[PDB]
């Protein structure tokens, strides 16, 4: 079971990797403590198919506080994914970076957040605005040091009304705390 799943996930066949990811997602949703296999799924993370990348990101987010030490092997992957040409991939990476409740991981995510704050894609701008608020809620001092308040203020005075509304909501949430 567990050994077979680990062997399937550590294989070079994408057809088996997708099935293993689906089984791991179902086990976690079915109520199975699958946090012990977090390091095994770490290697099978950089995948071209977006179907397995989303499941891996969701598992890491759900298995981030449980195994913060094993999450140190994803900063490079997040940095690499924060520059994908597809706006959806960048937005997903930004959302996953802010969702990871790791104290030693949010410190290194300031550079990708700063890069994506001025993203031309409105979805990327909204994702960066949400990630800034998430980081500020997780660490207000880190957000203040990164100087994201000035970027958030300029977001309201720009185009993309959805992005402007998202930035306004993030600023209100930050000021609320």
């Amino acid at each position: 079971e567990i050994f077979e799943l680990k062997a399937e996930l550590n294989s070079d066949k994408k057809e088996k990797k997708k099935e293993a990811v689906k089984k791991v997602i179902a086990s976690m949703t079915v109520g199975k403590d699958v946090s012990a296999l977090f390091p095994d799924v770490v290697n099978c993370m950089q995948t071209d198919n977006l179907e397995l990348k989303k499941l891996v990101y969701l598992y890491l987010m759900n298995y981030a506080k449980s195994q913060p030490d094993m999450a140190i092997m994803a900063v490079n992957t997040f940095v690499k994914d924060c520059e994908d040409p597809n706006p959806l991939i960048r937005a997903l990476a930004v959302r996953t970076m802010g969702c990871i409740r790791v104290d030693k991981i949010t410190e290194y995510l300031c550079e990708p957040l700063r890069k994506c704050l001025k993203d031309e894609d409105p979805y990327v701008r909204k994702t960066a605005a949400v990630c800034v608020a998430k980081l500020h809620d997780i660490n207000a001092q880190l957000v203040e040091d990164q100087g994201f308040l000035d970027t958030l203020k300029d977001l309201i005075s720009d185009s993309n009304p959805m992005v402007v509304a998202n930035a306004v909501a993030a600023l209100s949430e930050i000021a609320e705390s």
Binding site: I25, T29, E51, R95, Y123, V130, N166
Partner: protein, 415 residues
Amino acid sequence: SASAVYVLDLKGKVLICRNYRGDVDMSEVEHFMPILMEKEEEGMLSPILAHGGVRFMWIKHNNLYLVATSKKNACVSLVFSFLYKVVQVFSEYFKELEEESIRDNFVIIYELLDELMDFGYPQTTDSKILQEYITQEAPRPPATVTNAVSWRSEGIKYRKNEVFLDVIEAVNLLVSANGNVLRSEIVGSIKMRVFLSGMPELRLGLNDKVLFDNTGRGKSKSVELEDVKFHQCVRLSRFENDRTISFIPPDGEFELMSYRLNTHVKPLIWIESVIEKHSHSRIEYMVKAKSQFKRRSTANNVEIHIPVPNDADSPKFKTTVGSVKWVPENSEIVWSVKSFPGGKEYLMRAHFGLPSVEAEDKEGKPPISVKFEIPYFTTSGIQVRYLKIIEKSGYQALPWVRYITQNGDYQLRTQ
């Protein structure tokens, strides 16, 4: 300000959960079921629960309760709106809302939950727009979400340009047991199924009383809608300025406007019912229905629900027109009529037995509800005047609309 959106089941098992902020532990869902059971068993059960410092505000779905945990002073209205949007999206994507699709459509369900809301703040709620970025069977997100028009995808092309409208009437009447009507409200519903090529900017025009008064024609039949709620595509500023209903219709069927005004006219159906219930011996149901509506209109599928005794058995019905059947599941006499011409008069004489032993507790008097549905009948008299379909390319639209009159909250209080 929801902390974690989760989907429960009828047995207390969480079908799916999606944390949004992570400020609430995932183990608090276990106490939600005992708390709900205690509230229901004590009469204090409410959709907004509270597990100490964490509030569990959620609604009950067809098979599971969409409970969303929250800890801070989050907007309950925002949480309810997000839950309603999620339910609508699930209905649009999945034809059924049950546990059969929760355990079978998790691959797309998780992606939809992740994309819809981030950090407790939803960003996209259009099922049609969301279907172009998240599929269960991915390209870049469509520009409609990024653009201002997030409810009409550009580039839609069709062989023909036909738009079907539906002027659905809701006749709600609250008649007291004394015979007087207390709450008599009629809520209009302009539901249109727009199917055209491109992104036309519909210019809805009706014979509104306010519009007629402003134009100077406040002397003919004008609809006086007390409350008019336009859809997201309808521009609020245009309607507020000079009653200009200009909006881009969506691709599919959607509710554009929903009028809601009181009605001061006599009921379309007058029900005269009597209860000759003997003391544990027998019962009589002298129910007479008088149709006050126009004779040119026929009420298709008339269903006047008459609540009979719960313990009544061996009943006999002596009616005039229409099939009358007693359903033990509902414990009432279903006065089912297929076609009811306007001005018709149906008389019924019920007769059922009653056990000698009296019931342990009272059962109450459920109201008598009629299910009349007369199509091609506009009780409010509101008629569509024009529909300005304008397209940059230029095409000849063929709009269509139908008027349907039915019974809404048309309940009759029992004596």
